[PDB]
Amino acid sequence: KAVYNXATM
Amino acid sequence: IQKTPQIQVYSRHPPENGKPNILNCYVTQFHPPHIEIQMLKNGKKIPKVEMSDMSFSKDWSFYILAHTEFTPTETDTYACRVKHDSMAEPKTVYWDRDM
Amino acid sequence: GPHSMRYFETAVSRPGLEEPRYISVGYVDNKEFVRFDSDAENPRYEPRAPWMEQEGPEYWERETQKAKGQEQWFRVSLRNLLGYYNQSAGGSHTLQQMSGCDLGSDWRLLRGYLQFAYEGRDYIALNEDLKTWTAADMAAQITRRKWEQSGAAEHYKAYLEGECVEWLHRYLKNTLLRTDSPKAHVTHHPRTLRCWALGFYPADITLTWQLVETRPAGDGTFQKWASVQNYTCRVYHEGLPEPLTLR
Ligand SMILES: [Cl-]
């Protein structure tokens, strides 16, 4: 299952 | 940095006239991902070539595999033709049934 | 034996359109099983392996919706990176994320993976401890500082140790645990012998004498040769009782 990204760059 | 691709054309089995096979064209170590690949049978674009879904290696360079089922002829040539930003004009690599 | 899951995500912005193209490809034990393309019929997660279609509709409704979140996330960062590197508009730029978990022996976690690259160069990566970051350029020092105040590595470790290894199990339980082992020929042509190893799986093979990269053979198995009668060629592969020899 893919990962969900928190804070952007 | 932009990276020119790396073409390799090869067969699935050792070619023998009459026995079905797959012909591969493996292009790697390139960037940016936008790239065009066409496999040729005596200078003719092979109608429907199955291509892999593009992934990228550990060094982040992109790779993609173009293959087609085929049954070879000893008096027929097979080539792969690539067009990418890193090259002036397209690069063509032929099969070389020996090695 | 060793097991692994990986997700290679890529976002390419180009001078033509306004939204970049976002593609995600998943790999279980180095075979592609799920894909997401934003340039498609209706962008969604589709199974890329036969054993993976028996998943149920709720499964693809979450992954597709989570993929749509990632793509926005990539859209925002790319715009953020133009400023970080003082790039003006008019070019094409790539953002890449690699993420996954290496399992083992006991179906336990060995090493987590969370790393990003910009213009195909290393930009920031979660370390082995899953709690601290590594950032190459100064332009990424910014991101490290704000991901530290963000508690970002905490979320990612929770994933790598959480759903990553749990969901690796269930895919594995569902062709994969099989082993195709090489046919070995040698090309007897000169000006220089040449050893061939054809039709093997997986791709971890090794050839020596008394060079080209292991590559897919177009059907799910791999191929390799080594270039060089007092010489012998030895083959070493996982599915092998003992390494095979040929002169
Ligand atoms: Cl470089």
Author numbering:
A (entry chain C): 1 to 9
B (entry chain B): 1 to 99
C (entry chain A): 1 to 174, 178 to 194, 200 to 218, 230 to 247, 255 to 273
Please, what does the article write about this entry?
Presentation of pathogen-derived epitopes by major histocompatibility complex I (MHC-I) can lead to the activation and expansion of specific CD8+ T cell clones, eventually resulting in the destruction of infected target cells. The interface surface that results from the combination of each peptide and MHC-I is key for recognition by the T cell receptor (TCR) on CD8+ T cells. More recently, Achour and co-workers also addressed whether vaccination with p3P-modified APLs would enable the tuning of endogenous CD8+ T cell recognition toward a viral immune escape variant. It is well established that infection of C57/Bl6 mice with lymphocytic choriomeningitis virus (LCMV) induces robust CTL responses toward the immunodominant H-2Db-restricted epitope gp33 (KAVYNFATM).32−34 Upon CTL pressure, a limited number of mutations in gp33 emerge, with consistent patterns, allowing for viral escape from CD8+ T-cell recognition. Our analysis also revealed that H-2Db-restricted peptides, likely due to the presence of two heavy chain tryptophan residues, force peptide residue 6 to adopt a suboptimal backbone configuration as also previously observed in multiple crystal structures.
We therefore designed an l- to d-phenylalanine peptide variant for gp33, which resulted in the new APL F6f (KAVYNfATM, where the lower-case f indicates d-phenylalanine). At the same time our simulations in the context of H-2Db/pep and P14/H-2Db/pep complexes suggest that the l- to d-modified peptide F6f is compatible with the H-2Db loading and TCR P14 binding, even if with a slightly different geometry. To assess the molecular bases underlying the effects of the l- to d-substitution at peptide position 6 on TCR affinity, we determined the crystal structures of H-2Db/F6f and H-2Db/V3P_F6f to be 2.6 and 2.4 Å resolution, respectively. Starting from the backbone of peptide position 6, we observe that the phi and psi dihedral angles calculated from the determined crystal structures fall in the main minimum predicted by the corresponding MD simulations of H-2Db/F6f and P14/H-2Db/F6f. This minimum is slightly shifted with respect to the corresponding minimum in MD simulations performed on H-2Db/gp33, thus resulting in a slightly different conformation of peptide F6f compared to gp33. In H-2Db/F6f and H-2Db/V3P_F6f, both distances increase in comparison to the corresponding structures with the l-amino acid. As a result of the l- to d-symmetry, the side chain of p6f takes a different conformation in H-2Db/F6f compared to H-2Db/gp33. Interestingly, the aromatic ring of peptide residue p4Y, essential for recognition by the TCR P14, is profoundly affected by p6f and rotates clockwise from its conformation in gp33. Most importantly, SPR analyses revealed a 10-fold lower binding affinity of soluble P14 TCR to H-2Db/F6f compared to H-2Db/gp33 (70 and 6.3 μM, respectively).
